Design a protein around this ligand. Structure first.
Ligand code: NAP
Ligand code: NAP
Ligand code: NAP
Ligand code: NAP
Ligand code: NAP
Ligand code: CL
Ligand code: CL
Ligand code: CL
Ligand code: CL
Ligand code: CL
Ligand code: CL
Ligand code: CL
Ligand code: CL
Ligand code: CL
Ligand code: CL
Ligand code: CL
Ligand code: CL
Ligand code: CL
Ligand code: CL
Ligand code: CL
Lengths: 327, 327, 327, 327, 327
């Protein structure tokens, strides 16, 4: 689509403005340091009774309380988990807002589903890198950056897009290219990807192939190699050269085998269920389910975690990664 | 069934009693004004920090706080949304109750599902008009009223039915006729009607017919007319003259067409699902689901709302209603 | 689509022309009186041995025989039931036609399905109000009118559209807005609407909900209220404010209930059968079936009528409408 | 498996230690009195504003507040309903814990699903009798006891198992035999048993047989006898002599009938659903559902209760039990 | 239904009459001793070449041969297994019958299915206790009795009902209450109960739950506890307090779990098969099958017995009952 680069953006809208980064996780740290290193005026609002409070001080940030940071700053960038953003916002951020300020996120989940409703006269933007905090910071240290996303949900003051592009210019996303999408599009495609393919899809795929080999009498070690370990090789090829580049870089036996058997693994039933997974995200049923999970104490989620940790594929991968020196 | 009219009821049980109407929505306003205009002693309990507080004052009501009204009155009529009645009751009403008082509703949802448990020695009645507040008030201004429902859930003091009929006599329902049913029967049939036919049923019916025409290449404007706009004509005929009166008032081509094709639209599957919808209401699963919807932040409900507002039938109806001068 | 209003139309093509309205039903009477009252020269052709003959005289119309009217007039407007139009046309209208005359209808059923084939040099137009005769006349008495449809099936003389818009200008449809569609589009969408939703669809929906409650032990009176009587309230809201306006004007419990249960009542099977109902209308199978119904003596239709009149919902609605004073 | 008896256990680990029994239900009372009567130092922590507070005093226990008891004791035995343990623990128990103390339960539901997370340095054990409080106390009064379960979830201090066996020795379970299992195994099999067979399974079985007879025209009284009342006879035989002992103690006609028809009642579908019921317990979905039931006000649960009380089998059993003198 | 008690019955019809009890099983012994102890004149007819012959003598009964007893007595009470009653009757009882005598049973299986056809002028009655012989005798020793059933199949002489009530008065059933049903109703409901629920139903239920746990890796000992051993607790509660009393006496987690999962174990397929099991009893197909089982040497029945004794649930229950001291 339309891309913004360095030549296409300036720091005019962020120049004389104080930016509060709420949160010091991987994205909290990487984005805060980059913008500070880009010349932007940054304060980091955290909980006094927290671990990241002391780490953010070790890095030389003006560390404040979340209320203290919300009050001082014109731009509040919220990088905390979606499942507690709403509660932290309505208690410790919303009261310290005023006409002219800007609300910024790296994820549109809370805005899109109504868990955070901004006050009148407040901009709502998104500055979303498409790489983990570690890479965000690392590429920025090297004079390059990582591809990112930018969005405008509410343009109260008029320079919402420029504020978001200014923040993206300071984080370094602009060096690699920034794409303008919508809060709804970022949210829905992000939830669908993680659920249907990125996290859910592939782990069930790897489980099924591994369990097929193991139940057929094949060595668990060999099964882990051909259904899990080796997969990184193929993805890296697709990541760099695309599908056609991958097929050319693998053996013709592997190419023919993949092209003739793959429609049998992802059947029509899988595709019909992918449509329901998307509709459950669209109409808010998944958000409801995820919210009630936290409200009910995450018992379902913690049981699944224990079951996942008891998998044979886990125990075999640990031994193999131990031998390799990967783990 | 058995009907109560004006000749069948008196104000003996409500005469020297103070009635608190909690809430000033369509029913809050219409019912409060009618009873006051009928000679009954009315106070209106509201939130001081609310909009209806000032409107209720503009109409000349003794406006009080919900606690203030609960304390003063012998009869507390609660006309606020079911999904917050329980919380408002257990905090600001229950403490100001005493033996001899009466708890009154226009909807039995909260009593029936245990979200409001009355104290010992307190009457639980229902005064439920079967028309919207606007009509309730309007018909009463004209010397007539609107058909209503009356119920007794707990007869602590002995004049529970008379208190409810006295309130119905002051609201004006008695002029058109009042029917005595049960809190469970009002609740279950109300939930089933709105879900299976009144709101859910017909909108899905209108959507399907409209989407059938549009997907077949028919003009969206013409599709809106023959699947939505015209429907009011038929309902008004059924409302006034019943089914047989409607069929006689439409063309024989429309009559034959309707009588021979309609069993094909509401199939056996629709009727089997109507039975499950009823059982989900009966056994409290819907109430649980609706309660968790509010507890989880109404994300599912707000997503559905946005999707409903993005429908083609909405955009076409707006243009047609704009031309007509209806909207 | 494109709308014609008063400022967009004139009486130039109907000015010095005699218009015969064949039929004095609800539309016959309303349309004839309006055009006469608008200044147009109207004669009403009827059967001498008929009831409407004397009523049309009481209203001051030049009442003629159908042949007499067909001969005198340049424009013949046929407002009699579709199932006898063809026979009345080929015997008492077609012979008195000449090049330059215009054939006009409010319904394109007979033209579209070949039951009326016009002679060469004769215009075929449609002047179709989208409201019942009573409203057509009433709104016209009040300086406003009712939304209508206009169509040109054959433009022999050149002013077919102007003749139809002139008639629509005299009936008063032009004050509310007139839409130009086709004889096929009016016919097919009209038949589909009445069959799938307007008459067939909703009555089967109301039957199923009512029969569900009654078979579950609920009071027939209460079942009629929540599956029939109350429905008028919702439709009137959709009629005036559309879907979104209705949902906002009902309780959140009714809104959530409707949005989550309605897809279960109109299932995929209902939508597949709606497509067949449309194809049966498109390819003329329904017209064949309706024609053979009349030819065979309407035994099937009269049996269905008797069965409809024996329904429990009829007997309960009559008692409730009797109490209300509606019937 | 491996059983612990009296000869296998001592009071060494509980000797100079104060044991707080939180709760005075059937198990609270029976277990507290037994351990006190066995020589152990017991205090009973309860709510001051509660009924059991006064009953526990009538029995001569040192009655304390839950916080008071948590502070004084080294061993805190929590015998309150699982659905409020977590809230009572995190507020009134967790703060008064210290390294060296022990957390004890008769049910592992809250520990296993993460609703109670113990502090570092605190033992987590289970002392679970396999009989109701009434029998626990009664058998102990008679020099015998009731079979029990023992578990160690966290062995911080080293004598966790001995502390649990010491408590089991004081409750009297050791006289009948104590089995060491795991918190997960006790929880999952307990939930599965109550749901699939012990409470859910058999009541649906009794309902189906009773409803089969009644719908076939058989006397409800006779149906209750042959589908409910008589069942106690068979269970008591299985309880004492096992399956083979039961079959030998019934008529050959009843034996042949049971052995040839029973596979037809519990079909493959029942067994497939038993596997899903177990997986829903394993992965925490049932715990989530039960938690949300309480959070949402137990509307679903209270509706089911009312429906259960309206069953014909209830009304007929009451009359028969009334005649018998059982009720 | 209608109950007979002590105040409602006398010994007038049995006073000067000799009662032969054929058989000295649990019911043979208990019923014979009770009637003798009640003042009735009893002789016990048995096989000379049998074990019970000597036991019946040890108890002080006038012990006779079956023919000797049939000849002496006016009332012949047959308490031997249904599958040999017919052969013993037609050879050693029928010839010693005369007009005026009475044929009595505790089970109507043989009369109802035509295996015993009485001679003209002979009464056919039923005296059926609803408890095992051990309890019949024990309760009678304690001044109370056990609930019973009474039936009249043929009233030849006129005092058939009185003879049966007199026998029930001597057995002691009248102290607890006696119900009058029919030979067909006792038989069919007895066969259905034992097959669908009492013996067949519950053992297959217990097998499925136990096998579910065991196949999932749960300890067989723990599986026996939660699918078999504990069940006695629930039944005893239903036996004494009914369903509602049981649910109130179990944990809310067990109650919610049971009410929401139980419809999944007894599915529609189970209920359809219960109807076939009943029809097979009604139309005599089961009786035919049971008769051919004995005629063919009980090979099928003895194989099933061996298979039942080889079950894992048997071996685990034996070890657990051994530890408990139950077995
Ligand atoms: C990468 O890490 P992650 O983002 O996925 O997870 P995370 O480490 O759990 O949270 C990331 C950041 O959010 C903060 N945070 C989390 N929950 C919070 C709350 N309730 N109130 C205030 N701040 C909160 C954390 O601060 P803390 O260090 O205070 O938890 C941390 O700086
Ligand atoms: C027709 O309107 P509607 O009944 O459907 O909806 P609504 O206007 O949202 O509520 C109707 C009435 O209930 C009151 N109300 C709503 N939520 C309340 C709460 N939490 N506490 C106290 N009063 C509350 C409103 O007072 P307010 O004007 O204070 O909201 C209003 O008078
Ligand atoms: C609104 O009424 P509706 O239109 O639905 O029904 P309708 O009253 O049966 O017919 C409407 C008009 O058509 C006329 N008509 C019906 N059948 C006719 C025929 N075979 N020949 C000539 N005129 C005929 C009627 O005249 P008549 O009064 O002569 O029937 C009446 O004026
Ligand atoms: C057998 O009875 P059961 O165990 O099934 O049921 P239960 O009688 O409702 O509870 C058993 C015990 O737990 C206590 N308890 C229940 N809810 C409590 C709470 N929220 N906080 C503190 N103590 C609580 C009760 O004390 P109370 O007598 O104070 O309810 C009672 O001693
Ligand atoms: C409780 O025991 P149960 O009734 O279930 O079983 P059962 O002990 O096998 O039979 C109960 C009674 O019936 C007698 N009996 C069984 N088969 C007989 C036959 N063919 N002819 C005569 N008497 C017969 C037995 O006498 P015996 O002691 O002679 O077998 C016994 O007194
Ligand atoms: Cl760094
Ligand atoms: Cl190649
Ligand atoms: Cl699909
Ligand atoms: Cl007013
Ligand atoms: Cl007709
Ligand atoms: Cl069904
Ligand atoms: Cl007029
Ligand atoms: Cl809202
Ligand atoms: Cl199709
Ligand atoms: Cl005691
Ligand atoms: Cl045998
Ligand atoms: Cl399976
Ligand atoms: Cl004895
Ligand atoms: Cl409760
Ligand atoms: Cl069937």
């Amino acid at each position: 689509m339309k891309v913004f680069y360095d030549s296409d953006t300036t720091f005019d809208a962020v120049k004389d403005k104080t930016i509060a980064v709420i949160g010091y996780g991987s994205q909290g740290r990487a984005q805060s340091l980059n913008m500070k290193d880009s010349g932007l005026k940054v304060v980091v609002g955290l909980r006094p009774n927290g671990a990241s409070w002391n780490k953010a001080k070790e890095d030389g940030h003006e560390v404040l309380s979340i209320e203290e940071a919300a009050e001082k700053a014109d731009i509040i960038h919220i990088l905390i988990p979606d499942e507690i953003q709403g509660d932290v916002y309505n208690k410790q951020i919303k009261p310290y807002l005023k006409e002219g300020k800007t609300l910024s996120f790296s994820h549109g989940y809370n805005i899109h589903y109504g868990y955070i409703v901004p006050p009148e006269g407040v901009n709502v933007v998104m500055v979303a890198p498409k790489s983990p905090g570690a890479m965000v910071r690392r590429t920025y240290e090297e004079g390059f950056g990582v591809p990112g996303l930018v969005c405008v949900e509410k343009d109260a003051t008029g320079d919402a897009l420029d504020i978001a592009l200014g923040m993206a210019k300071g984080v370094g996303l602009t060096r690699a290219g920034v794409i303008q999408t919508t809060f709804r599009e970022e949210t829905e495609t992000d939830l669908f990807g993680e659920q249907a393919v990125l996290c859910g899809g592939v782990t069930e795929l790897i489980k099924a192939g591994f369990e097929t080999l193991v139940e057929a009498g094949y060595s668990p070690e060999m099964a882990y190699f051909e259904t899990c370990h080796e997969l990184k090789l193929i993805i890296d090829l697709i990541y760099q050269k695309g599908f056609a580049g991958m097929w050319n870089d693998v053996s013709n036996t592997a190419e023919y085998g993949g092209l003739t058997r793959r429609s049998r693994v992802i059947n029509e039933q899988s595709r019909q269920e992918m449509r329901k997974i998307l509709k459950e995200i669209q109409d808010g049923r998944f958000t409801k389910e995820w919210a009630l999970e936290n409200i009910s104490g995450k018992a379902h989620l913690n049981s699944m975690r224990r079951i996942e940790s008891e998998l044979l594929i886990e125990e075999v991968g640990a031994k193999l990664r131990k031998m390799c020196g990967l783990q």
